[PDB]
Amino acid sequence: EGYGKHITSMHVRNIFNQGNQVIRNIVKQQRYELLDFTGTEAGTTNLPKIIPYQCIWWRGLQNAANVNQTINNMIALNTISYGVRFLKAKLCIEVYAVTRKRLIQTGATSYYTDDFEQGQNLFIGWADRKAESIPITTPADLDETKLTVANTTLFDANNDNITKEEVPTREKWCHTWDLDVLNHNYLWEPNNLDSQWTLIPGAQAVQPTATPIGPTYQEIVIATKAIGANESALVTTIQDRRSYPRLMLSQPQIKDETDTMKFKYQIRISTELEMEHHIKPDIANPWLTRQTLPLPALSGDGTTRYVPCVPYETHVSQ
Amino acid sequence: QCIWWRGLQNAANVNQTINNMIALNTISYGVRFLKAKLCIEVYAVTRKRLIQTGATSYYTDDFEQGQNLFIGWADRKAESIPITTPADLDETKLTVANTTLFDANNDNITKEEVPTREKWCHTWDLDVLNHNYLWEPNNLDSQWTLIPGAQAVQPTATPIGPTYQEIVIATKAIGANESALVTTIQDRRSYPRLMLSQPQIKDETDTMKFKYQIRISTELEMEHHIKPDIANPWLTRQTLPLPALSGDGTTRYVPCVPYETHVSQ
Amino acid sequence: EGYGKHITSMHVRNIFNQGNQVIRNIVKQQRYELLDFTGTEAGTTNLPKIIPYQCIWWRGLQNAANVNQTINNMIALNTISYGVRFLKAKLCIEVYAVTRKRLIQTGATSYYTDDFEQGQNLFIGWADRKAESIPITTPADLDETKLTVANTTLFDANNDNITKEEVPTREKWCHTWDLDVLNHNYLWEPNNLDSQWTLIPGAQAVQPTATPIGPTYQEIVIATKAIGANESALVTTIQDRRSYPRLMLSQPQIKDETDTMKFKYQIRISTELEMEHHIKPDIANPWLTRQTLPLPALSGDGTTRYVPCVPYETHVSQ
Amino acid sequence: EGYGKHITSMHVRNIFNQGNQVIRNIVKQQRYELLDFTGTEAGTTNLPKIIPY
């Protein structure tokens, strides 16, 4: 019997983490953006701007100049994390200015100036009644300022199918998503979010045939992770649907002499992505990946790839 | 993790309970394992003592009581078990090279101590199946068979198949015609490998070598759901086979995944 | 006035972290060690074993084979952390075996065998009445199993100055330190703990003259951090003393025919170091280092360097 | 003294059944039978039918 202090008969002691530890990092990207409908080229056209939130735009991947520590935090944690969990996504669009290019038309003279239209708002279209995919050619292609789709508008004089919120000059527009869809102790394979054809959590059961996302868009996931030349693992979970219709920023369709009015906006668009890295255990366990499954990503050799963006789910009584 | 619960490593340990099962698995359309009780009763702890004088090396075996038996779980590691044959899974001769419960750098094993006269009882719940599903009746005569529970891991050379999934999908033939679609949900199960060992103690020229005498009791509670009073070959639609390492491989590695990482909600 | 949902008049919004975020990592190293008094060489001698906790031995730096994720977690976080805080240190020594080399002496025959002495304990000396420095030549030199100092013992037949706890075979010995000494919102400059002449938090006002630790051993710290070719910062904080006497593992001094008895022990020594990384802010601020100050480290060109290990502080009534 | 979980000092343990276990089976036979008094042969005669229980 030892007489020392803080001495006790040992119990079962293994101090290693058992793989359960969590650190919530928030990948937050904040940008003062020019939203320009006055140009005829490079997405400056009146065509509405798409916010490709269904993608990994939440990182600011379209411009490497917007990389901050939160990304460099994630890039670091995704080295030590066996799986990651996205428990929120917070998009906030703060309008500041509303400017439009005024035209005084005298013969061919066409005087130009830019004036403040405050009293007209910014239109946030959801495209929640339609099935409209977003093309993604490159990371720069998903910049919400230059991202457009031809023959698309928030205003259809025949059937206007879009819910369009108005964001005045000094108001702000904040929308929040819950990306935590995974259950049954499953996690997302840690990604540094460096590929745009990657897609956010949630199951849009739709996928292109040329660019299959794979089982990760299902309510019921089935896949085989290799994890090694030998030990390949069977990932099977249940997953809730998610719609994720495309946000469409636009100006009104107002008609002026010879054409529509062309506005331009100045916004500070804040994106907070709450993501909880479950850090690797204190002892190597390559097989934790059995409960991790990859982020949905558009596959194939296709250069330009169309994210589904399914508008809505139809609820059914019971 | 295997069917060692039957004593398949030695046909001399066959008793009525096996011959009960072998009989019931004839009349049962499906079987359910609702418990597994492993109990290791130590009796003796003996070690080979060495008195080293020059090269003389006197040997004797003495009682070390006061040192215990170490039950390692290997619950922090992913460590597969090789199975060559039924005799290969005898817990007494079953070993893996360069494996120990003691790593002077990172000691990753939870190791319980079982003294001489103490006993060590651990219990598993093999009832994982739900949705009125059952396990295809097996006489438990193949060691590459594996117990219920879903370790989502399987070797690529020896696929267990859907029976390790939380979500099972398979097609049972049941006939040249009527093939059935078995789909159920299943909970994960870890089932890390128990590792019996002595301490690593270092003696002159080598470690100390103990030897133990244990009475290892295995109770496997298994509920046979007997065939109906009228032939219904299609009951197998809700029965699905036991997980078994497939392939032509002679030596096959059971996954033995250590643990599941729980996630708050 | 915009009519949308989740729209509001903006307030002051900057979502960046303001530098305040914390993730507690635990650097935990667990080792089953041979503690051998039976040898005549390489620290196997009867000389007591020193646990160099005053150093960064908490990482297992003496052997790169003991590197685990917790280190590889820290190594990663110390990239994204502007400062780190050590809020506990937990040392736990679990004895398992007590073995000794028995000698049957007949003429010159000298039969040898190793038997179990259970009923004799393991002695944890604190050296709390003495000032005894620890030599550090290399990282391997601080291995607690081979670390010894000549003419040192826990047993002095004249003045026995050491508090020595007994750890039996199956008992365990757990001691805990509080390394949080820093106050005034100061932190420790993030270190990957890869240098052994680094030393743990706490102020032993003593430092060698050949290897000055510097102001980081003071109750009152003063230093100038360069942080740049220009902007050098003035770090000044108040700090509590810390004694940190050296742990000395030993067997009893028992005398046998011709010499003392030589035991050997088998222990599982668990080290949990709770350390809270304060992660870099979401925006680069090189000047956060004004409130970070480096870990105390033995300086100089000296190969072998002596950590002070002051035994105790003398309290004074008021 | 072992420190593990679910460890205890052994008592007398022999897990064998001691011969006492019981499973009730029901031997049930269900038949739609022709009971024929109209024939002159092979028990079809008016003679009563015996149920040889």
What are chain B's partners, defined as 3 or more CB pairs within 8 angstroms?
A, C, D
Shortest distance between the Cα of B76 and any Cα of chain A, in A, equals 6
* H or E segment to which residue C80 belongs: helix C69-80
Q: Are strands C164-167 and C122-125 parallel, antiparallel or unpaired?
A: antiparallel
- For residue B53, the chain C residue with the least C-alpha distance is C111
Hey, are the CB atoms on A227 and B188 less than 8 Å from each other?
no
- Distance CA(D50)–CA(D53), nearest Å, equals 9
Among C29, C33, C266, the residue with its CB nearest the CB of B199 is C266
Residue C102: burial class (beta carbons within 10 Å; 0-12, 13-18, 19+): middle
Residue type, A301: D
C284 by Cβ neighbours in 10 Å (0-12 / 13-18 / 19+) ranks as: exposed
- D7 CB neighbours in chain B (<8 A) are 112-114, 118-121
What dihedral do alpha carbons A205, A209, A210, A211 form, nearest 10°? 20
Which DSSP letter does residue B153 get?
A: B
- Do residues B128 and B167 touch, judged by C-beta distance below 8 A? no
Helix or strand (DSSP H, E) at C8:
strand C7-9
The Cα D9–Cα C277 span in angstroms is: 47
Q: What is the full DSSP assignment across A291-310?
A: SEEPPPB--SS-SSEEE---
How far apart are the C-alpha atoms of C29 and C70, rounded to whole Å?
8
B200, C32: Cβ pair inside 8 Å?
yes
Contact of B35 with B126, CB cutoff 8 Å: yes
CB B201 within 8 A of CB B7: no
Q: Tokens at residue D50, please? A: 């015996």
CA C116 to chain centre: 31
Point out the residue among C34, C63, C104 whose CB comes nearest to the CB of B202.
C34
CB distance C30–A15 less than 8 Å?
yes
* Cβ-defined contact of D7 to B41 (cutoff 8 Å): no
**Other Cβ atoms within 10 Å of C308 Cβ, number:** 24
Q: Which helix (H) or strand (E) element contains residue B215?
A: strand B209-226
Q: CB A120: neighbour CB atoms within 10 A?
A: 17
Interface of C with B (CB under 8 A): 29-34, 36, 60, 63, 65-66, 68, 96-97, 99, 101, 104, 109-116, 118, 169-170, 264, 266, 268
Chain centroid to CA A170: 24
CB atoms within 10 A of CB C162: 25
Q: Identity (one letter) of the amino acid at B29?
A: Y
Across chain D, the runs of DSSP E, i.e. the strands, are 7-9
DSSP state of C78: H
Helix, strand, coil % in chain C, rounded to nearest 5: 10, 35, 55
For D8, phi and psi rounded to 5 degrees?
Answer: -155, 160
Give the chain A residue whose CA is nearest to the CA of D5: A12
> Which of B67, B107, B208 is nearest residue C32 as measured by Cβ atoms?
B107
Q: Tell me the structure's resolution in angstroms, rounded to a single decimal.
A: 3.3
Identity of residue A210: A
Residue B239's contacts (CB-CB under 8 Å, 6 or more residues apart) are: B29, B30, B133, B134, B135, B136, B137, B172, B182
User: CA distances (Å), A254 to each of A257, A258, A263, in order?
Assistant: 10, 11, 10
Distance from CA of B167 to the nearest CA of A (A): 6
Question: With an 8 Å Cβ cutoff, are A10 and C77 in contact?
Answer: no
Comparing CB atoms, the residue among D3, D4, D5 nearest residue A9 is D3
Distance between A242 CA and the closest CA of chain D, angstroms: 45
CB contact under 8 A, A12 and D1: no
- The nearest alpha carbon in chain C to A16 belongs to C28
Mutate to test the interface with A, among D3, D6, D7 (most CBs of A within 10 A): D3
Say which of B69, B117, B217 has its CB closest to residue D9. Answer: B117
All residues at 6 or more sequence positions from B137 whose CB lies less than 8 Å from its CB, including other chains: B24, B25, B28, B29, B30, B31, B224, B239
Packed helices C69-80 and A69-80: angle between N→C axes, nearest 10 degrees? 170
Rounded CA-CA distance A212/A298 in Å is: 6
Instruction: Identify residues of B whose CB sits under 8 angstroms from chain C CBs.
Output: 49-53, 58, 64, 66-67, 102-108, 113, 199-204, 208
Q: Mapping DSSP to helix (H, G, I), strand (E, B) and coil, where does residue A218 land? A: coil
Amino acid in the structure at residue D45:
T
User: Measured between alpha carbons, how far is A44 from A37 in angstroms, rounded to an integer?
Assistant: 5
Which among B153, B103, B136, B105 is positioned nearest to B259, based on CA atoms?
Answer: B153
Chains touching C by CB (3 or more pairs below 8 Å): A, B
Check: CB of residue A55 under 8 Å from CB of residue A204. no
Smallest CA–CA distance, residue A231 to chain B, in Å, is 4
Please state whether beta strands C111-116 and C81-104 pair in parallel, antiparallel, or not at all (unpaired).
antiparallel
C116 contacts in B (CB within 8 Å)? 64, 66-67
Q: Are C130 and C308 in contact (CB under 8 A)?
A: no
Question: Are B261 and A82 within 8 A, CB to CB?
Answer: yes
Query: Could A12 and D5 be called an inter-chain contact, meaning their C-beta atoms sit closer than 8 Å?
Result: yes
Euclidean distance between CA atoms B53 and A187, whole angstroms: 61
Residue A165 to residue C3, Cβ atoms within 8 A: yes
Torsion angle in degrees (nearest 10) through CA of B129, B133, B136, B141: 20
Residue A176, SS3? strand
Decide: A36 and A178 in contact? Cβ < 8 Å. no
Which residue among B39, B114, B217 sits closest to D2, beta carbon to beta carbon?
Answer: B114
| Torsion, Cα of A74, A76, A77, A78 (10° steps) | 80
Whether A236 and B152 lie within 8 Å, measured CB to CB: yes
B-C C-beta contacts closer than 8 Å: 68
Of A123, A71, A75, residue with least CA distance to A95: A123
Query: d(Cα C39, Cα C195) in Å, to the nearest integer?
Result: 29
Cβ–Cβ under 8 Å, residues C86 and C180: yes
What residues of chain C lie within 8 A of the CB of B50, using their CB? Answer: 113-114
